[PDB]
Amino acid sequence: QAIYLKELKQSIKDFTNQVSIFRRDYEKNGPMVEGISPAEAMERLRRF
Numbered sequence: 001q002a003i004y005l006k007e008l009k010q011s012i013k014d015f016t017n018q019v020s021i022f023r024r025d026y027e028k029n030g031p032m033v034e035g036i037s038p039a040e041a042m043e044r045l046r047r048f
Contacts (some may be wrong), residue, residue, distance in 0.1 A: 025033065030044045 028034075030048055031041060
């Protein structure tokens, strides 16, 4: 049961910085209002 607790630990630990790099990709990439991007935004929005 303990090693499963430590697995849950490392899981939460890595998921945190995953969400970090997630929110950090957001501001520079995609639906943020930066360029024209004529009607292509759907592809990147769907990958998001």
